[PDB]
Symmetry: C3
Subunit: 434 residues, 3 copies
C-alpha cells in the first residue's frame, strides 16, 4: 500500500491502485520517458564537460590605431670595409673570409680588389692578438642606419635615425621604429593609405656585403632587408617571422590590427626568467638563452641575461651545433603556449618600380651614385593601416553551467515532471522505508 | 475570513512539506527549498544578464558556385599628367601645382634641370605678356591624364577580346582613372565561370614612363616611383584608391588571385551596422564627408568629389583645400550586407628572352622601354566559390524562456501559473 | 466515469473548474494566454531546429612538428627548343605553333635568323618517312629536366636532389612534385619556423630553350618563370588554376600556415570517384574533365588518368582543346567540399638575387653570362612561419537534446506540462469516448 500512498509525489505515476489493470502501459510510458531523460541528460552533461568554445569575429571602426613596432635588418651583418685585422683574427673563420689556418681560402678565384684588402689585413703568422667583443664588433662593423636611411616620413612629418633603436638579433645590429623604449608615448595612425604610415628610403650598401668566391659551402647570394611588423609587447623574431623587401621597388605593406582573445584550460590552451611580459617569441628566446647558457656557459648577442658573450671559438664549436641539436634531436626544453590577450598585424604586400626615368637622374645627383648603384641598392618601404579599424577574434565559452541546468531542468520537466526536490522527496521516502 | 491557511495550500504547485502542523527534524525542506530558490535566482539572473548582453557568434561557410559576378577593377597610372600634352595655358594656372614653376610663373632651378626638359618648358612658359584664357581642372585632367587607348596594348576577359569600350573614366585623387566591369549604363555585369589566370581580366599596359612629370634640383617632392595603382571593389562601392589600392610594377605579369567574401553584420543592440550616392558604403560616406567639409570651408569641390559645387581652381587648391585636408584628419560604421575581395599576388618576368624582340618590333619600342614600361595584370577568381562570414544572434528570447523555464522546473517545479497561484492566494489574504 | 470538475489530479495548472461560475475566469485567459505563448515559442525552437544551422569554432594549436606539404613546380615553358626532333616537328609542329597547316615555317621573313636556321635544319620533310609518336614520350623527353633546372636543393638545412622529386604531368607539361609521399616512406616534416628550415631550391629556368614567337601570332606567352602549387599530399596539383608565379632574379619567400578545415554534411552543410582512390575538389574536377574528353573525344590528354589512349596532336587540336573550351560556359560538373581537409595559407615576400658580391661567383660556378644569371636564376623558399596549425570546424548549432531541454522548459514555464501530462489528458479523453 505505502507505494500507492507515495502518489501525492511530484514524479508522474498512475501505476499504483488496489487492482491490476489495462493501464500497465504507464509502466512502459514512464520507464520509456525515464530512459530518454537519462540518455539525453547524459549527452548534455557529457557535452558540458567537453568544455567546447565557439568564435566571435567582429571588425570595429576606430578613431585611431596605435602604430606597431617595425624591426628592420640588412641581410648583410658586417661591412667589409670596416673589418679590422684584429676582427679578421677572431671572426675571420666565422665570416667565411678565412679557412681554419687563418688564411685566405682560394686566393686565385677571389675578386682582385677583395684579395688586396684581405692580404693587407690578414697576416696572422706573427700577429699578437688584442681583446675582442662580439657585441663591440657588431656595433662597429654592422650597417649604420645613419648611412642606410636616405629619408623617413611618418604621417607625412619628417623622421630620422633618432626615432629608431639598436636591437641585436640573429641577423646582427638591427633597428626598431616606434619601440616605445624609455616610455616615450607610442606613435599612432589617424588616416588609412600609403601616405600616412611609416615611409623610409634605404641604400642597402650592397658593395659592403661580405664577398663570396671559389669553392665555398655558402649560399648567401641574396640582397635586401628583412622586416618584422610586431606589437611593442613582443620582441622581434625576424629570424623566422620577417618578410623580405627587395631593392629597386617601393614595397607597400597594408596592415590590419588583429585582437585575439583565447580561453584558458579546460576550454583552450591560453596562459619568464628574462622578460617581464609574456610572448610566444619572448618565451622561445628565454628558452634558447637558458639552453645555451647551460650547455655552452656563454650567451649569443641577441639573447638577454648578464651571461658572458659567446666568442667565435664558442659560437662555431659549441652554440651553433647546440641549436642544431635543440630543434631536430631534443623535444622542446620549453614548449611555449599562447598568451590570452594579444595583438597580431596582417600584411598585404604590393610593389611599384623605383626609380622612374624622370627621378633616376635627380637621385643619382642628390646621392652622388651611379644609375646602376641606385637601381641595385635603393628601396622605399611603406608600412601603414589600410583603414582605421581592428579585427577582434574572441574564443567564447560554448556551454556554461547555468545553461546546462536549464537544459537538464527542461529535460526532467518534459519526461518525468521532476525537480531536485521531487528526487529528494523520493529519497526521503526510501530512507523512511529503512 | 473564509480563505485557506498556508497549511491548507498543499494544493500549491511549488514543492512544500513545510506545513505539517507540529515542528520536526524535517526543517531541512525549509533549507532545501530556500537553498533551491537561492540557486534559481542566482542562475536565472545570469541567463537574463547574458540575454541583455545581446552577444553574437560567427558562422563561416564557403559555398561552391556555378558562376561568380566579376568585380569592378579601377586602375590608375601613378602619373596624373603627361608632360608632352601640357599646354602654355595649362602651365599658366596649373604650373605651380605640378611643381614645374615657382610662385611667379618661371622655372625654379634651370641649371640643374635636364637640358631637354628645360628646352621644352622655356618653349611653353613665356608668361610676362601672356593674357590668360579659360581653364577647367576637369577638362585639363580629361586631356593631359594618360589615355587608356594609348596605355592598353591588349585586353582579354574569359579568353575573348576586350577594348577601351569595356572601361569607364573615373576621377580619383590619382587623376583620370579607368574602371572595368563598372556596370554603369545598366549593362549586365560580366561573370566568371572557370578559375585560374586564363579566364579572368588580363591586360598588357605601357605606363608611358617618359611622359611622367620631371623632378629636378632642390625639390621637396619624392614621386620617384613608376607603375599603376589598382582597387578590386564591388560595383556598389566607389573606388578609394588613395587608401585601398595596391601597386603593380612594370616588367612583371602580376597575378591577383581573388575570392568573393560576403560579410553580414548585425545592427545594434548586438553589433554596429546600419545622399550624394544612391547606395551606402564606408568609402561612399568618407567621400560624402570629405566633399561636405571642403564645399563648406572652401566653396569649391575637387575633381574626384561629387556634388553640384564648383571645381576647385589651382588658386583655391593651393591656398584653401590642401591645408583644409591637412587640418581635417589631424564616425562611418559598417553596412549590414557587403562584398569584399581577398587578393593573393604572385609574379613572373616579362618579357621572356624569346619574345623580347617580337615586342620591340610589334610596338616600335627600345629593349629598354619595353622592360621599364610594359606590365601584364591578371585579376581572376582562384576557384568558383564565395566565403560567407555572418554574425548570428547568440541567445534569442525563445531560448531564454526555455532556460529560465527549465531552471524553475529543476529547483522549485514552478511555472508562471504556480507564481500567479501564489499571488492570487496572498491577494486573498488581503 | 470521471468528472471534468473532478480532474484536479490533472498536471497542467487549472483553477478553472468549480461547480458555480466565478469572477476568477481570468485563469481561463491566463491559461489560454500561457498556452498561446508556449505554442508560439515552441514552434520557433522546432522551426529553428529543422533550419539545421551551424556555427564556427576557430582554434590555433602549437605543434612540436608539422607535416611539410607537397610542392608541385612547373617551368612556364613545356618544350625545350634544342630538344625538338624532326619526327616531333612533323606531328607536334602545328601544335607548338612552330609550323602552319602546310608543315612549313609560317612567316620566315620575320623569324629570328638563328631560329629559322635551326627550324630549316629539322623541318625538311621532302624525303622523310614518319615514325611512331607518343605525346607522353615526347613531353618526358623535350620538357625541361629538373636535373638541369635545379642548381641546389636544401630541406631543413640538409642536402636534397632531383631524386626527392617525382615527375607529374599537368596542363603545363612535365612538372616535379616534392614530398609527394609516393615512395611509401614517411612524409617529410618541419620542426623549426623560418626561411632556413623549409624547402629552398635555386632554379635556372633555361629561358633560351623557350619556344620562340615571331610574325603574325595571336599570343600572350611573353612571360618567364615557374608556377608553383603548395598542396596536401591527398590532393593532385591543379597548377593551371591554384598555382602562384615565381619570377627570376628574386629569392621568393613563401611563409605558410597549416589550416585544418572540418565541414558538416547535409542537412547542415554541403560536405562529402572513378579515377582517384582519395576524394578532392581538384581530384573530381580532373576526373570530370577526363570523363567528358574520353566520351566526346575517345582519347585522354597526358595529365589525365584513365586507361584511355593518349590524345594525338591531330586530336588535341581539333577535338579535346575546344571540348574543354565548351566545358567553360555554366557547369556540367558538381564538385562539393570534402569533410576533413588541409589548406596552406601563403604570404609572399622577395629579395634580389644575385647580390653584387656573389654575381661573379655564380657566373663562374655555372659557366653563364652576367645577363643569363640575372634573367634565368631564382631561389624559392617554402617554409612554415611558426610551428602551429589553425583549425576551422563547422559545429552543429542546435542538437536534438538541446531542443528537448528548450521545449521542455518552455512547457514547464507556461503550463507545467510534461509528455506524461499530455498522455494523462489523452487517456482521459479516450475514456470520455
Amino acid at each position: 500500500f505505502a507505494n500507492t500512498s507515495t502518489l501525492h509525489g511530484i514524479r508522474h505515476i498512475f501505476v499504483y491502485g488496489p487492482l491490476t489493470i489495462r493501464r500497465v502501459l504507464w509502466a512502459v510510458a514512464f520507464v520509456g520517458s525515464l530512459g530518454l531523460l537519462l540518455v539525453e541528460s547524459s549527452e548534455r552533461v557529457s557535452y558540458y564537460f567537453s568544455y567546447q568554445h565557439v568564435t566571435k569575429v567582429d571588425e570595429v571602426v576606430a578613431q585611431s590605431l596605435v602604430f606597431p613596432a617595425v624591426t628592420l635588418c640588412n641581410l648583410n651583418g658586417f661591412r667589409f670595409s670596416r673589418l679590422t685585422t684584429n676582427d679578421l683574427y677572431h671572426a675571420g673563420e666565422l665570416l667565411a673570409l678565412l679557412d681554419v689556418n687563418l688564411q685566405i681560402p682560394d686566393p686565385h678565384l677571389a675578386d682582385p680588389s677583395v684579395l688586396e684588402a684581405l692580404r693587407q689585413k690578414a697576416n696572422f703568422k706573427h700577429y699578437k692578438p688584442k681583446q675582442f667583443s662580439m657585441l663591440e664588433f657588431l656595433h662597429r662593423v654592422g650597417h649604420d642606419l645613419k648611412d642606410m636611411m636616405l629619408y623617413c616620413k611618418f604621417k607625412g612629418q619628417e623622421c630620422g635615425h633618432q626615432d629608431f633603436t639598436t636591437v641585436f638579433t640573429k641577423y646582427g645590429k638591427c633597428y626598431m621604429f616606434n619601440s616605445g623604449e624609455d616610455g616615450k608615448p607610442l606613435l599612432t595612425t589617424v588616416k588609412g593609405g600609403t601616405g600616412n604610415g611609416l615611409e623610409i628610403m634605404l641604400d642597402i650598401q650592397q658593395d659592403e656585403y661580405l664577398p663570396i668566391w671559389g669553392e665555398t659551402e655558402e649560399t648567401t647570394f641574396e640582397a635586401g632587408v628583412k622586416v618584422q611588423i610586431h606589437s611593442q609587447s613582443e620582441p622581434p623574431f625576424i629570424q623566422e617571422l620577417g618578410f623580405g623587401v627587395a631593392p629597386g621597388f617601393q614595397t607597400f605593406v597594408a596592415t590590419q590590427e588583429q585582437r585575439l582573445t583565447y580561453l584558458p584550460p579546460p576550454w583552450g590552451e591560453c596562459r619568464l626568467d628574462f622578460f617581464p611580459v609574456y610572448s610566444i617569441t619572448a618565451c622561445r628566446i628565454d628558452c634558447e638563452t637558458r639552453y645555451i647558457v647551460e650547455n655552452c656557459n656563454c650567451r649569443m648577442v641577441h639573447m638577454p641575461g648578464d651571461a658572458p658573450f659567446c666568442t667565435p671559438e664558442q659560437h662555431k664549436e659549441c652554440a651553433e651545433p647546440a641549436l642544431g641539436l635543440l630543434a631536430e634531436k631534443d623535444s622542446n626544453y620549453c614548449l611555449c603556449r599562447t598568451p590570452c590577450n594579444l595583438t597580431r598585424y596582417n600584411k598585404e604586400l604590393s610593389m611599384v618600380k623605383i626609380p622612374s626615368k624622370t627621378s633616376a637622374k635627380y637621385l643619382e645627383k642628390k646621392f652622388n651614385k651611379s644609375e646602376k648603384y641606385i637601381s641595385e641598392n635603393i628601396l622605399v618601404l611603406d608600412i601603414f593601416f589600410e583603414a582605421l579599424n581592428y579585427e577582434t577574434i574572441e574564443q567564447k565559452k560554448a556551454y556554461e553551467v547555468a545553461a546546462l541546468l536549464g537544459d537538464i531542468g527542461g529535460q526532467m520537466g518534459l519526461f518525468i515532471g521532476a525537480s531536485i526536490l521531487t528526487i529528494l522527496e523520493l529519497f526521503d521516502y526510501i530512507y523512511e522505508l529503512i
